[PDB]
């Protein structure tokens, strides 16, 4: 019993449909071709199905109008790369490239992607009837930059006909194209500013796209690697996919640097790399995990603190607005053609989203600092429990020491009668008495639980309020986006900059209190080490002095055997 | 510089006025008599001022329409009693009695009261020109029942003329008067039901008012006590003022009983009084203070728990509605004359206020139970700290016991050579070894901190929501009160009864968890006593066994002196 539900779309000579089982969640797309076909087209569809048996919603999101997040673009490169190489191994050229061919499928947080409009049709497909797999490189890299910037790499916002008439008139050794308001065709051989990708990836992706967006058909793939039978863009993509890039969120200056690393980097070698590269001393390189764990350098988002500097100044915002957006900050009432307005507003929304991520990640590392504080706390609890244990045990040892030497003093005083006693033993036991004489236990305990209660007081956010502010702004961008003055948006910029400044300065006060707690702990540690060491040493001396007293008793047994 | 502010009222031949200093809070009432008086009236006012140099807002509150709280009436009796006797000692009859003569003055929570409308003018003042101090007794006791019920003791809601025409036609040996809807004059020699005063006070206040509201002028004060020159009502009022009445809020049945007590009652004698009177066993008489302290019976709102019974059934509401109010619960749309409606609605508001006080005081004793739980907790913490202290000290004593007897075993084994050793000492030291052999320490510790964390979980109110419901109801009574259907009020009765039932049953679950915690603690206590006792005893045995070993060493010194 298959339920004839709503369609999944329009496909073939009919509709792509959703046929779920009536009881279970068993969905499949069935490409309806019930319409009477010619036998070349019917049989054509037959071997189409036979060979088949052998994302566009994400392309139109409000939150990535200037393009997608880095890691998501990476996963699209590896997944759609495996699909495209999977089709080229199967001696199959798809040629029907579009974001609608790609399935969304959550597997535990991971979206999986397989392959199932004149902007994707190749210019040699605009001209000639036969084709090669180069159209997959042109349309695919085209769609890749449609993930990178959110829109078309060549002359976007035009109709595709005159668009390809300028593609075949474009210098193919360039990357990005745009058109100004004065009618100038200005095109760039480099990627634009609105990007989230690290430059270490960008420039091999730049020249990679110089091979990809080369509209000359014979040079779309690469100078072919004759050792692995492989075009150059595949080699560059597998090169990029195995880049080991870490990220150290430079907290004290509100920065982050990506680090392209060799695969044999020990963490100590990376400590030297940061000490020479960033100039931050390894005696103060405080490196916390996403869970706030300090590393082991014996192993091969990282959070960067200065162990020395407790003073935390203001954040160092190295991201400005573009001068279009700052022009609208200065003058919001100018009613331009609304395409450039949604461009400017989009840049503003991506900026304020950057601010949201700033409070997000700084907030995150603040929490990780608190978790490391908890780990130091548990260390302190262990050390103080062992400390007062051995302390009080040592006190009882002193107790039976004093009673024992009191009894020994009695027996010595009685055997004094016959002149048996030797005074060097007595003065030795007096020395043992002064050593038995030999508070800050409980006082430094009060330092411990005082700091403990202080931390718990520090335990007692506003970027959700700024999420309502930015959320209002992106709602403005949506309600102005579906349409065929910007003052209030600049006011949201005001409230987000100033509110962000307030809560960042308060959290910097929190962090200063945290490092004060941490330095107080690290000051408390060798107190516990020296104190515990004196406890164990003094213990073992008193125990050996009891054994030495038993050697004196033993010597009295020698005196008993002497007579 | 005195500021001529607004008046304080109208008085004399002008206005009672507020003349504050312009800088300080120095207020005084000045009785303006600027109007041209005759010299008997001007000089009359002169000796009035000369003798003077030698509350009505509270009478009209929305919350006490059926009369005032008990303790406040008590304080008015002692304060206005001291004022009236203060005036009768000064050979002065005021005769101008009204609630406007009484000053409100907060002193740390206490209102102080001193003395400065035809319903207060006496019937002999309605008839004759000369008078005595009996008019103070009539008008004063009149105003007293105007505190007790909130309105006039004789035929209220009438005009004062025909009112006194029925006062002089009333049987003066009765107390309360009313008039029915059919024109019947029905008057009562007892106090009505809408009262908060305890009956132990009510009936001497009943007969006290039978002397007070006796409109026969010669019998208003009393059969005069010839030993203290004192009318009977003064003797009865000082008798009532020195009554020592405590209150035990019977929590398990949702009750409270006042207890008139002799002044020499020990708390153990009162435990017998509760065990025979209430039938609640002194082995289960759990008596907690307002701070939740269990008493010392060696000393002379009390909270009553059953130590045995952990099952807490539903509350036992012995306060019903009157059948007028229940009639309006059954039929709310009857538009009566609105005087009886505000009477019925007023009874409803006082009922729901009683419910508010029920949740208030049960909530209060619940909190006191939690405070007593905290006291037991601190006791447990002390006992466990001392316990693990003496435990681990005992462990170190066993340690040097075993090393000591190991060394003694060595010396004994070496002096075995010459046949010096005596095997009874050896077998004795083996017995000492098994005694040295002679977990639930830390296990019952886990019981302790397990229960501690469980209590802290129980630590994590709705009568404020019912305060909004009742507050809505008294707002209905005010908005219908200022006017010259009751269904929604009965719906508030529904929500307050059912919501009150829900939160009371939840809090009864809380209390069951509390007594479970308490019985768990009291089970944990003799474990600590027996365990600690075994620790101290076993300690003192091992220490004496070391001293006995020193007596054996002493005996070896006797063996050394033997040769």
From Swiss-Prot, chains A, B:
SMART domains referenced in this protein's UniProt entry, alphabetically: IKKbetaNEMObind, S_TKc
PTMs per UniProt: Phosphorylated by MAP3K14/NIK, AKT and to a lesser extent by MEKK1, and dephosphorylated by PP2A. Autophosphorylated.
Family: Belongs to the protein kinase superfamily. Ser/Thr protein kinase family. I-kappa-B kinase subfamily.
Gene transcribed to yield this protein: CHUK
Record-given protein name: Inhibitor of nuclear factor kappa-B kinase subunit alpha
Tissues and organs where the protein is expressed, per its UniProt entry: Widely expressed.
Catalysed conversion reaction: L-seryl-[I-kappa-B protein] + ATP = O-phospho-L-seryl-[I-kappa-B protein] + ADP + H(+)
GO-annotated biological processes: anatomical structure morphogenesis; canonical NF-kappaB signal transduction; cellular response to tumor necrosis factor; cellular response to virus; immune response; inflammatory response; innate immune response; negative regulation of NF-kappaB transcription factor activity
Residues in coiled coil: none
Assembly information from the UniProt record: Component of the I-kappa-B-kinase (IKK) core complex consisting of CHUK, IKBKB and IKBKG; probably four alpha/CHUK-beta/IKBKB dimers are associated with four gamma/IKBKG subunits. The IKK core complex seems to associate with regulatory or adapter proteins to form a IKK-signalosome holo-complex. The IKK complex associates with TERF2IP/RAP1, leading to promote IKK-mediated phosphorylation of RELA/p65. Part of a complex composed of NCOA2, NCOA3, CHUK/IKKA, IKBKB, IKBKG and CREBBP. Part of a 70-90 kDa complex at least consisting of CHUK/IKKA, IKBKB, NFKBIA, RELA, ELP1 and MAP3K14. (Microbial infection) Interacts with InlC of Listeria monocytogenes.
Active-site residues per Swiss-Prot or TrEMBL entry: 96
Predominant location category: cytoplasm
Uppermost EC category: transferase
Keyword Iron-sulfur: no
Result, substituting residue 10 to A: Loss of phosphorylation and decrease of kinase activity
Modified residues (Phosphothreonine): 10
Comment block on domains: The kinase domain is located in the N-terminal region. The leucine zipper is important to allow homo- and hetero-dimerization. At the C-terminal region is located the region responsible for the interaction with NEMO/IKBKG.
Pfam families: IKBKB_SDD (PF18397), IKKbetaNEMObind (PF12179), Pkinase (PF00069)
PROSITE patterns: PROTEIN_KINASE_ATP (PS00107), PROTEIN_KINASE_DOM (PS50011), PROTEIN_KINASE_ST (PS00108)
Gene3D superfamilies in the record: 1.20.1270.250, 6.10.250.2110, Phosphatidylinositol 3-kinase Catalytic Subunit, Chain A, domain 1 (3.10.20.90), Transferase(Phosphotransferase) domain 1 (1.10.510.10)
